[PDB]
Amino acid sequence: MREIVHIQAGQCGNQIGAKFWEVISDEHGIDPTGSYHGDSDLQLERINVYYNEATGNKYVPRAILVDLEPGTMDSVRSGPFGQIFRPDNFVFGQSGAGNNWAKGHYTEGAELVDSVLDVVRKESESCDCLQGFQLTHSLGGGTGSGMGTLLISKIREEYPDRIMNTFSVMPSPKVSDTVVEPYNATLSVHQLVENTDETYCIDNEALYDICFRTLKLTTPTYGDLNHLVSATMSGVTTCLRFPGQLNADLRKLAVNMVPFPRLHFFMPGFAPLTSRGSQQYRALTVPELTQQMFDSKNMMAACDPRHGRYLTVAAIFRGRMSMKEVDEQMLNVQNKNSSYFVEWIPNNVKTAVCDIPPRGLKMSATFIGNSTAIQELFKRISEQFTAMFRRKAFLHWYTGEGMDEMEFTEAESNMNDLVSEYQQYQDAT
Amino acid sequence: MRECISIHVGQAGVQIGNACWELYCLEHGIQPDGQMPSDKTIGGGDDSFNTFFSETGAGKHVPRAVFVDLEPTVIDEVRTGTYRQLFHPEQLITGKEDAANNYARGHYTIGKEIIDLVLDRIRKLADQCTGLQGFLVFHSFGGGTGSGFTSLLMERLSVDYGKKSKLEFSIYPAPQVSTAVVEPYNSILTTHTTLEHSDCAFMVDNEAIYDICRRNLDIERPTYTNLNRLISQIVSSITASLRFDGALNVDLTEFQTNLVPYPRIHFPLATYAPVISAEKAYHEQLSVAEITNACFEPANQMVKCDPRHGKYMACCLLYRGDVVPKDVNAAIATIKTKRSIQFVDWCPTGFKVGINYQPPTVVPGGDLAKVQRAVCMLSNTTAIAEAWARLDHKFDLMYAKRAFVHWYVGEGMEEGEFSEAREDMAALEKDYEEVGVDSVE
Amino acid sequence: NSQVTVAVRVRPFSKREKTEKASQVVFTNGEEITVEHPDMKQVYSFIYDVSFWSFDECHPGYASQTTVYETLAAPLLDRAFEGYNTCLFAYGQTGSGKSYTMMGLNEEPGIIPRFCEDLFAQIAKKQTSEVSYHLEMSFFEVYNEKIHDLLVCKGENGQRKQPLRAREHPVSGPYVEGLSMNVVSSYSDIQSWLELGNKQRATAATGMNDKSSRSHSVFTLVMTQTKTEVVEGEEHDHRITSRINLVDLAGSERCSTAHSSGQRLKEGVSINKSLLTLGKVISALSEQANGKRVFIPYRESTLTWLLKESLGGNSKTAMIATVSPAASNIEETLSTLRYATQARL
Ligand SMILES: CC(=O)O[C@H]1C(=O)[C@@]2(C)[C@H]([C@H](OC(=O)c3ccccc3)[C@]3(O)C[C@H](OC(=O)[C@H](O)[C@@H](NC(=O)c4ccccc4)c4ccccc4)C(C)=C1C3(C)C)[C@]1(OC(C)=O)CO[C@@H]1C[C@@H]2O
Ligand SMILES: Nc1nc2c(ncn2[C@@H]2O[C@H](COP(=O)(O)OP(=O)(O)OP(=O)(O)O)[C@@H](O)[C@H]2O)c(=O)[nH]1
Ligand SMILES: Nc1nc2c(ncn2[C@@H]2O[C@H](COP(=O)(O)OP(=O)(O)O)[C@@H](O)[C@H]2O)c(=O)[nH]1
Ligand SMILES: [Mg+2]
């Protein structure tokens, strides 16, 4: 059966994957020991998509946690679902990157890529058939960007027929949790565009505004944003694990949501998102979910979709529903809002409906979109970059580790050309 | 004897076949364990009719069918559901990975080394059949399995067996509604290969059945397990003369001889009598005239194409239940008297007639109502060119930029294989525009 | 930009093809090049900017080798002489007439040798002691979007062909890291280099025939001009460079009649993708010449990437297709002509 290998690069990768396994176990009925404690016989039929079996009816996940400087690894082992992971898969070296793309692609990444890829082969060759891989990292910073991109390159050199699906946290417009963000983001995009099939551009400000406006939360920590991102992660790969009326997968979404290979940067979203009081004052139905989905305040990309046209979008539904209502609503969205849709694609939407919803809901939807508003996530990066590169601001730390300015100009040149390919379809034709 | 193999391909065909067999088992008397206490209580008769069901010595009845999807998430419902104990355990999944909506993987990358099993089971299920023959492929234009695997299987069965009546009850893409952004390519790519080998392919569209189901059956929130049952009723009205006794029978080659004037124009439309709900079954007569006048009503057509922009090359009317021929003849005459139903001058006859006695069954927990008569129309008209003129336009928009094409060339396929498959469909449209013109002496 | 010049050529019947008496499917009426199936059904028409007929030595407009040079390749030297770059792409399957067209026979020269010899003639004619001329040669190949060198003599071991990589200079443009470059003064040198290059090129013995091609070859000349003598100190100030790129592509080979599996299938995908993107680029540039607003996908492949300063800008580009007139090769002829038409529009 189809299978995924997850990798966790960077603090964020490891701060999100924990919450993702906490959600998969909740759906599949596994405890910290690995033991099955479910209720239905439909949680174990396709458990192989994420987990491997063990001796005493225990289940071990296929995680490979690579992080230079073992500080963030130690936090997992002293956590709820830390003692289910394989200790042989925790691969970490000391002297962390230091938010340097050079110290996580060239020196220490090169030290620690062989030990990572060994476990990759160990886990992959023990799969019946393999579909693709999965990685969670944060651009702008160090480890997660550089080491992640290095692993992606090595793997797509080894296994190119298979999917590499990165779920990447991106920089924000106003907040700057890290000062060398544009440079690392530029280099990471230059390495991801050529070596990726579909990546998802999560952004933190959008998640904060989702947590404050819709959820009406007052003290939203990181576990809540990771909760939203895990939600989406789980929903994408549902139709491999559970059955339904119109089954989807990663490769159908890839063949459909990607008209040209370089435009594989999407905006995600999750839907039923309500407050603890406003769930008695609505009605879960397909139209309410679609309205929550196409709204600009449930997308995670920090990019208002109304500043550009949708090239393609996808809705993965979960629950007992009616395909008539689904298609009628997705057609009304096209016929009303045609100015936000592209004309050389007659139907810009697809659908996917599973039959098994989450542990405590009747309906659920995830939303994905390839748009042209994503310009304003990279144009800014190409403006922060050149304001810093024109004066050689944060540079000597990177030249000092066996690098050159040519690579940086190249990466800038590649991001700008991406922005041009996007702008080509933002005026009506 | 007489026999008909039923092949299902993809997730459209499986979910349809499940409904079809839920209907067939209840019509004949079989229960999901294969056994038949009806015979043990009655003590005779071929009611376990040998067209669809092979019979062992232990009283079981195992049906003549295969079904493939290249992904086990679908058929593993059958290996777990109610019909576990009925169907042969050879349900040839080889679904290590799906066809991802491309003809490219359904035709060559994940097609080769798997079709051999299908052809082997077909050889094993044909040599057990010393009778009339003909195969029924159930697939959907638009998938990677409904397109390429179908085009691969028919081009091989046209070598292995040859002069046999092959048929295809295929799902058709709706104009506006569609659940994929690639069906315009798969549709015409499949039509290129399945226009020379096949003999008569009946087409059905989801939007038509959806629009029917609220207007008549009063369902505003329908699903896929309430259109697949109507599809099974159509298949049963098509395949009933093989099984049940009747006043005027029509077999498999006859649909192929009446409704296919030229080799290439073998793509008609279908209808039934769904003005019939549980409450509206009363308040209504359901005569032969009233039901047959639902033929020419575009509101009851099962493919989105108004026939009043075209003419009828041929038509076939299969009647079930309590029907008397003069009622059918009055219906046909009342139809011909009208001027909204145009007919090609090279066909003044126009119609077939086929009558059988066994009425349709009610799949319990269902929407349709008990009837004393049912009707099916199979109509070859020149209107469906319009229903293709949209598809060949969509192609011509997204093939201008060469969009969604690198995924197909990535799984072994030429970029000049779409220009060669789009230059044949325009010829077919031109053929329809040619035959529909009346001759000037 | 300037008008990409597409051209065709219909080779004559071969010796065996005339002995076995194969039929004729492709006809011409001046500019029109139509294709009549023997007995099936409708005829497909095709129209191009230039058309060459080489079926028999009677017809008006028999385009021999000299006419092919003098109508397509000759003015490209002129623009290659005024400092502007130029590219000529060949396209066609095996058994269609590329090697007879581009290189040719020792008694019937192709386009490459006439190019080089007319070059050297115009060089030595103008070679005063105030205006010099330097030439620089190179030869490489794309195999599964990996750039390999061919002048490099290899050792007898396992995988020795080192894959070089591309890089973008902010001023010059895209280029190759480690592609050797050699000086040339006599075409004998170019021949002794090109034979050595072709002997190393990737060419698998496909089930149809042994001699084929599974890699895209590029043959680059650089023409450097030292026209500079200032009247104040007699010292060289400026220096023009022009790039000439003669490219030999590979065939479609749809994996359908040729059940391929393994390394002979990945090559297919690479070739088809490169041809799908190059046609896209040439179409977008043809639209760019027509005063519209278009984006040229240059980074979706390698050849489109390295040849980016030669195609666009104030350049001039050329393409030659080769088609067989027999009836057994109708699918390949159609696949080539349709491709060429897409390049045109
Ligand atoms: C009956 C009912 O309405 O209770 C809900 C509830 O009130 C709300 C507030 C829940 C609640 O969600 C949150 O509180 C929340 C807070 C911050 C950030 C994100 C979520 C709920 O906690 C969440 C919880 O939903 C789940 O448990 C899902 O399975 C969820 N998984 C987990 O929550 C989880 C469990 C263990 C460990 C880690 C995560 C899930 C989400 C997506 C995909 C798969 C599973 C449920 C029913 C509720 C509460 C409990 C209040 C909602 O949960 C979601 C996203 O499904 C938010 O929208 C739904 C419905 C309601 O608004
Ligand atoms: N009427 C009807 N149509 C269906 C049903 N299931 C799927 N379809 C249609 O068929 C198309 C789905 O493509 P499929 O042919 O199922 O794809 P597939 O055959 O599963 O093969 P893949 O494309 O590889 O998944 C959609 O356009 C649906 O409208 C069904 O139960 N009934
Ligand atoms: N969502 C989320 N983001 C985080 C978390 N921790 C760090 N980040 C993000 O990661 C970025 C910093 O990169 P970081 O992972 O620390 O660099 P690294 O240590 O080299 O991998 C910042 O932009 C943060 O927004 C977390 O727990 N949750
Ligand atoms: Mg499927």
JSON list of N, CA, C and O in Angstrom, two decimals, chain A residues 96-129:
[
{"chain": "A", "resi": 96, "resn": "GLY", "atom": "N", "xyz": [25.14, 23.80, 16.31]},
{"chain": "A", "resi": 96, "resn": "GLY", "atom": "CA", "xyz": [24.08, 24.24, 15.38]},
{"chain": "A", "resi": 96, "resn": "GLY", "atom": "C", "xyz": [24.44, 25.37, 14.44]},
{"chain": "A", "resi": 96, "resn": "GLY", "atom": "O", "xyz": [25.17, 26.29, 14.82]},
{"chain": "A", "resi": 97, "resn": "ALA", "atom": "N", "xyz": [23.82, 25.34, 13.27]},
{"chain": "A", "resi": 97, "resn": "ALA", "atom": "CA", "xyz": [23.98, 26.29, 12.15]},
{"chain": "A", "resi": 97, "resn": "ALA", "atom": "C", "xyz": [24.09, 27.76, 12.59]},
{"chain": "A", "resi": 97, "resn": "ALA", "atom": "O", "xyz": [24.95, 28.44, 12.03]},
{"chain": "A", "resi": 98, "resn": "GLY", "atom": "N", "xyz": [23.34, 28.23, 13.57]},
{"chain": "A", "resi": 98, "resn": "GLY", "atom": "CA", "xyz": [23.40, 29.63, 13.94]},
{"chain": "A", "resi": 98, "resn": "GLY", "atom": "C", "xyz": [22.62, 30.52, 13.00]},
{"chain": "A", "resi": 98, "resn": "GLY", "atom": "O", "xyz": [23.06, 31.64, 12.70]},
{"chain": "A", "resi": 99, "resn": "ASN", "atom": "N", "xyz": [21.47, 30.04, 12.52]},
{"chain": "A", "resi": 99, "resn": "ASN", "atom": "CA", "xyz": [20.66, 30.75, 11.53]},
{"chain": "A", "resi": 99, "resn": "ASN", "atom": "C", "xyz": [21.48, 31.10, 10.29]},
{"chain": "A", "resi": 99, "resn": "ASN", "atom": "O", "xyz": [21.26, 32.13, 9.65]},
{"chain": "A", "resi": 100, "resn": "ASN", "atom": "N", "xyz": [22.42, 30.23, 9.94]},
{"chain": "A", "resi": 100, "resn": "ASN", "atom": "CA", "xyz": [23.26, 30.38, 8.77]},
{"chain": "A", "resi": 100, "resn": "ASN", "atom": "C", "xyz": [22.93, 29.29, 7.77]},
{"chain": "A", "resi": 100, "resn": "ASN", "atom": "O", "xyz": [22.98, 28.10, 8.10]},
{"chain": "A", "resi": 101, "resn": "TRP", "atom": "N", "xyz": [22.61, 29.69, 6.54]},
{"chain": "A", "resi": 101, "resn": "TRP", "atom": "CA", "xyz": [22.38, 28.72, 5.48]},
{"chain": "A", "resi": 101, "resn": "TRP", "atom": "C", "xyz": [23.67, 28.04, 5.06]},
{"chain": "A", "resi": 101, "resn": "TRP", "atom": "O", "xyz": [23.62, 26.96, 4.46]},
{"chain": "A", "resi": 102, "resn": "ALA", "atom": "N", "xyz": [24.82, 28.63, 5.38]},
{"chain": "A", "resi": 102, "resn": "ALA", "atom": "CA", "xyz": [26.09, 28.01, 5.04]},
{"chain": "A", "resi": 102, "resn": "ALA", "atom": "C", "xyz": [26.42, 26.88, 6.00]},
{"chain": "A", "resi": 102, "resn": "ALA", "atom": "O", "xyz": [26.96, 25.84, 5.59]},
{"chain": "A", "resi": 103, "resn": "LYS", "atom": "N", "xyz": [26.10, 27.06, 7.28]},
{"chain": "A", "resi": 103, "resn": "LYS", "atom": "CA", "xyz": [26.36, 26.06, 8.30]},
{"chain": "A", "resi": 103, "resn": "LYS", "atom": "C", "xyz": [25.27, 25.01, 8.40]},
{"chain": "A", "resi": 103, "resn": "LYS", "atom": "O", "xyz": [25.22, 24.28, 9.39]},
{"chain": "A", "resi": 104, "resn": "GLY", "atom": "N", "xyz": [24.38, 24.92, 7.40]},
{"chain": "A", "resi": 104, "resn": "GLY", "atom": "CA", "xyz": [23.39, 23.87, 7.34]},
{"chain": "A", "resi": 104, "resn": "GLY", "atom": "C", "xyz": [23.18, 23.32, 5.95]},
{"chain": "A", "resi": 104, "resn": "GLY", "atom": "O", "xyz": [22.22, 22.57, 5.71]},
{"chain": "A", "resi": 105, "resn": "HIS", "atom": "N", "xyz": [24.05, 23.69, 5.01]},
{"chain": "A", "resi": 105, "resn": "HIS", "atom": "CA", "xyz": [24.09, 23.15, 3.66]},
{"chain": "A", "resi": 105, "resn": "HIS", "atom": "C", "xyz": [25.46, 22.65, 3.28]},
{"chain": "A", "resi": 105, "resn": "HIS", "atom": "O", "xyz": [25.57, 21.64, 2.57]},
{"chain": "A", "resi": 106, "resn": "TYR", "atom": "N", "xyz": [26.52, 23.32, 3.74]},
{"chain": "A", "resi": 106, "resn": "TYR", "atom": "CA", "xyz": [27.88, 23.06, 3.28]},
{"chain": "A", "resi": 106, "resn": "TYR", "atom": "C", "xyz": [28.70, 22.26, 4.29]},
{"chain": "A", "resi": 106, "resn": "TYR", "atom": "O", "xyz": [29.24, 21.21, 3.94]},
{"chain": "A", "resi": 107, "resn": "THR", "atom": "N", "xyz": [28.83, 22.75, 5.52]},
{"chain": "A", "resi": 107, "resn": "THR", "atom": "CA", "xyz": [29.72, 22.11, 6.50]},
{"chain": "A", "resi": 107, "resn": "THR", "atom": "C", "xyz": [29.06, 20.98, 7.29]},
{"chain": "A", "resi": 107, "resn": "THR", "atom": "O", "xyz": [29.32, 19.79, 7.06]},
{"chain": "A", "resi": 108, "resn": "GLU", "atom": "N", "xyz": [28.14, 21.35, 8.19]},
{"chain": "A", "resi": 108, "resn": "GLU", "atom": "CA", "xyz": [27.58, 20.37, 9.12]},
{"chain": "A", "resi": 108, "resn": "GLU", "atom": "C", "xyz": [26.48, 19.56, 8.47]},
{"chain": "A", "resi": 108, "resn": "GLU", "atom": "O", "xyz": [26.32, 18.37, 8.79]},
{"chain": "A", "resi": 109, "resn": "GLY", "atom": "N", "xyz": [25.72, 20.18, 7.58]},
{"chain": "A", "resi": 109, "resn": "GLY", "atom": "CA", "xyz": [24.81, 19.42, 6.76]},
{"chain": "A", "resi": 109, "resn": "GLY", "atom": "C", "xyz": [25.53, 18.35, 5.96]},
{"chain": "A", "resi": 109, "resn": "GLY", "atom": "O", "xyz": [25.03, 17.23, 5.82]},
{"chain": "A", "resi": 110, "resn": "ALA", "atom": "N", "xyz": [26.71, 18.67, 5.45]},
{"chain": "A", "resi": 110, "resn": "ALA", "atom": "CA", "xyz": [27.48, 17.68, 4.71]},
{"chain": "A", "resi": 110, "resn": "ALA", "atom": "C", "xyz": [28.04, 16.61, 5.64]},
{"chain": "A", "resi": 110, "resn": "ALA", "atom": "O", "xyz": [28.24, 15.47, 5.22]},
{"chain": "A", "resi": 111, "resn": "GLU", "atom": "N", "xyz": [28.31, 16.97, 6.89]},
{"chain": "A", "resi": 111, "resn": "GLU", "atom": "CA", "xyz": [28.73, 15.96, 7.86]},
{"chain": "A", "resi": 111, "resn": "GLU", "atom": "C", "xyz": [27.61, 14.97, 8.16]},
{"chain": "A", "resi": 111, "resn": "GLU", "atom": "O", "xyz": [27.85, 13.76, 8.27]},
{"chain": "A", "resi": 112, "resn": "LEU", "atom": "N", "xyz": [26.42, 15.52, 8.35]},
{"chain": "A", "resi": 112, "resn": "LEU", "atom": "CA", "xyz": [25.24, 14.78, 8.85]},
{"chain": "A", "resi": 112, "resn": "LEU", "atom": "C", "xyz": [24.19, 14.42, 7.79]},
{"chain": "A", "resi": 112, "resn": "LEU", "atom": "O", "xyz": [23.08, 14.08, 8.21]},
{"chain": "A", "resi": 113, "resn": "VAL", "atom": "N", "xyz": [24.46, 14.49, 6.49]},
{"chain": "A", "resi": 113, "resn": "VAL", "atom": "CA", "xyz": [23.50, 14.03, 5.48]},
{"chain": "A", "resi": 113, "resn": "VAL", "atom": "C", "xyz": [23.62, 12.54, 5.24]},
{"chain": "A", "resi": 113, "resn": "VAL", "atom": "O", "xyz": [22.63, 11.88, 4.91]},
{"chain": "A", "resi": 114, "resn": "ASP", "atom": "N", "xyz": [24.82, 11.97, 5.40]},
{"chain": "A", "resi": 114, "resn": "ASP", "atom": "CA", "xyz": [24.97, 10.54, 5.19]},
{"chain": "A", "resi": 114, "resn": "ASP", "atom": "C", "xyz": [24.23, 9.75, 6.26]},
{"chain": "A", "resi": 114, "resn": "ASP", "atom": "O", "xyz": [23.53, 8.78, 5.96]},
{"chain": "A", "resi": 115, "resn": "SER", "atom": "N", "xyz": [24.36, 10.17, 7.52]},
{"chain": "A", "resi": 115, "resn": "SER", "atom": "CA", "xyz": [23.67, 9.49, 8.61]},
{"chain": "A", "resi": 115, "resn": "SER", "atom": "C", "xyz": [22.16, 9.66, 8.49]},
{"chain": "A", "resi": 115, "resn": "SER", "atom": "O", "xyz": [21.40, 8.79, 8.93]},
{"chain": "A", "resi": 116, "resn": "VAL", "atom": "N", "xyz": [21.71, 10.76, 7.89]},
{"chain": "A", "resi": 116, "resn": "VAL", "atom": "CA", "xyz": [20.27, 10.93, 7.68]},
{"chain": "A", "resi": 116, "resn": "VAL", "atom": "C", "xyz": [19.79, 10.03, 6.55]},
{"chain": "A", "resi": 116, "resn": "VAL", "atom": "O", "xyz": [18.78, 9.32, 6.68]},
{"chain": "A", "resi": 117, "resn": "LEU", "atom": "N", "xyz": [20.49, 10.06, 5.42]},
{"chain": "A", "resi": 117, "resn": "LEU", "atom": "CA", "xyz": [20.06, 9.29, 4.26]},
{"chain": "A", "resi": 117, "resn": "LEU", "atom": "C", "xyz": [20.14, 7.79, 4.51]},
{"chain": "A", "resi": 117, "resn": "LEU", "atom": "O", "xyz": [19.41, 7.02, 3.88]},
{"chain": "A", "resi": 118, "resn": "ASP", "atom": "N", "xyz": [21.01, 7.36, 5.43]},
{"chain": "A", "resi": 118, "resn": "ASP", "atom": "CA", "xyz": [21.05, 5.95, 5.79]},
{"chain": "A", "resi": 118, "resn": "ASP", "atom": "C", "xyz": [19.72, 5.50, 6.38]},
{"chain": "A", "resi": 118, "resn": "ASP", "atom": "O", "xyz": [19.17, 4.46, 6.00]},
{"chain": "A", "resi": 119, "resn": "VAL", "atom": "N", "xyz": [19.18, 6.30, 7.30]},
{"chain": "A", "resi": 119, "resn": "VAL", "atom": "CA", "xyz": [17.90, 5.95, 7.89]},
{"chain": "A", "resi": 119, "resn": "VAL", "atom": "C", "xyz": [16.79, 6.12, 6.86]},
{"chain": "A", "resi": 119, "resn": "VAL", "atom": "O", "xyz": [15.78, 5.39, 6.90]},
{"chain": "A", "resi": 120, "resn": "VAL", "atom": "N", "xyz": [16.93, 7.07, 5.94]},
{"chain": "A", "resi": 120, "resn": "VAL", "atom": "CA", "xyz": [15.97, 7.19, 4.85]},
{"chain": "A", "resi": 120, "resn": "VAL", "atom": "C", "xyz": [15.88, 5.88, 4.07]},
{"chain": "A", "resi": 120, "resn": "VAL", "atom": "O", "xyz": [14.79, 5.36, 3.83]},
{"chain": "A", "resi": 121, "resn": "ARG", "atom": "N", "xyz": [17.04, 5.36, 3.65]},
{"chain": "A", "resi": 121, "resn": "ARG", "atom": "CA", "xyz": [17.05, 4.09, 2.93]},
{"chain": "A", "resi": 121, "resn": "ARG", "atom": "C", "xyz": [16.50, 2.96, 3.78]},
{"chain": "A", "resi": 121, "resn": "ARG", "atom": "O", "xyz": [15.74, 2.11, 3.28]},
{"chain": "A", "resi": 122, "resn": "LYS", "atom": "N", "xyz": [16.87, 2.93, 5.07]},
{"chain": "A", "resi": 122, "resn": "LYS", "atom": "CA", "xyz": [16.39, 1.87, 5.96]},
{"chain": "A", "resi": 122, "resn": "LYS", "atom": "C", "xyz": [14.87, 1.85, 6.02]},
{"chain": "A", "resi": 122, "resn": "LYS", "atom": "O", "xyz": [14.25, 0.78, 5.98]},
{"chain": "A", "resi": 123, "resn": "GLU", "atom": "N", "xyz": [14.26, 3.03, 6.11]},
{"chain": "A", "resi": 123, "resn": "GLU", "atom": "CA", "xyz": [12.81, 3.08, 6.24]},
{"chain": "A", "resi": 123, "resn": "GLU", "atom": "C", "xyz": [12.12, 2.88, 4.90]},
{"chain": "A", "resi": 123, "resn": "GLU", "atom": "O", "xyz": [11.04, 2.29, 4.85]},
{"chain": "A", "resi": 124, "resn": "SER", "atom": "N", "xyz": [12.74, 3.34, 3.81]},
{"chain": "A", "resi": 124, "resn": "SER", "atom": "CA", "xyz": [12.09, 3.29, 2.51]},
{"chain": "A", "resi": 124, "resn": "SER", "atom": "C", "xyz": [12.11, 1.88, 1.93]},
{"chain": "A", "resi": 124, "resn": "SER", "atom": "O", "xyz": [11.09, 1.37, 1.47]},
{"chain": "A", "resi": 125, "resn": "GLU", "atom": "N", "xyz": [13.28, 1.23, 1.93]},
{"chain": "A", "resi": 125, "resn": "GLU", "atom": "CA", "xyz": [13.39, -0.12, 1.40]},
{"chain": "A", "resi": 125, "resn": "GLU", "atom": "C", "xyz": [12.51, -1.12, 2.14]},
{"chain": "A", "resi": 125, "resn": "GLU", "atom": "O", "xyz": [12.21, -2.19, 1.60]},
{"chain": "A", "resi": 126, "resn": "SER", "atom": "N", "xyz": [12.09, -0.80, 3.37]},
{"chain": "A", "resi": 126, "resn": "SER", "atom": "CA", "xyz": [11.13, -1.60, 4.10]},
{"chain": "A", "resi": 126, "resn": "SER", "atom": "C", "xyz": [9.69, -1.19, 3.83]},
{"chain": "A", "resi": 126, "resn": "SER", "atom": "O", "xyz": [8.83, -1.43, 4.68]},
{"chain": "A", "resi": 127, "resn": "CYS", "atom": "N", "xyz": [9.41, -0.58, 2.67]},
{"chain": "A", "resi": 127, "resn": "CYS", "atom": "CA", "xyz": [8.05, -0.25, 2.27]},
{"chain": "A", "resi": 127, "resn": "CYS", "atom": "C", "xyz": [7.67, -1.06, 1.03]},
{"chain": "A", "resi": 127, "resn": "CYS", "atom": "O", "xyz": [8.48, -1.25, 0.12]},
{"chain": "A", "resi": 128, "resn": "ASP", "atom": "N", "xyz": [6.42, -1.53, 1.01]},
{"chain": "A", "resi": 128, "resn": "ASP", "atom": "CA", "xyz": [5.95, -2.34, -0.12]},
{"chain": "A", "resi": 128, "resn": "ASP", "atom": "C", "xyz": [5.98, -1.53, -1.41]},
{"chain": "A", "resi": 128, "resn": "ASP", "atom": "O", "xyz": [6.70, -1.87, -2.36]},
{"chain": "A", "resi": 129, "resn": "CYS", "atom": "N", "xyz": [5.20, -0.45, -1.46]},
{"chain": "A", "resi": 129, "resn": "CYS", "atom": "CA", "xyz": [5.33, 0.57, -2.49]},
{"chain": "A", "resi": 129, "resn": "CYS", "atom": "C", "xyz": [5.34, 1.93, -1.82]},
{"chain": "A", "resi": 129, "resn": "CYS", "atom": "O", "xyz": [4.73, 2.13, -0.78]}
]
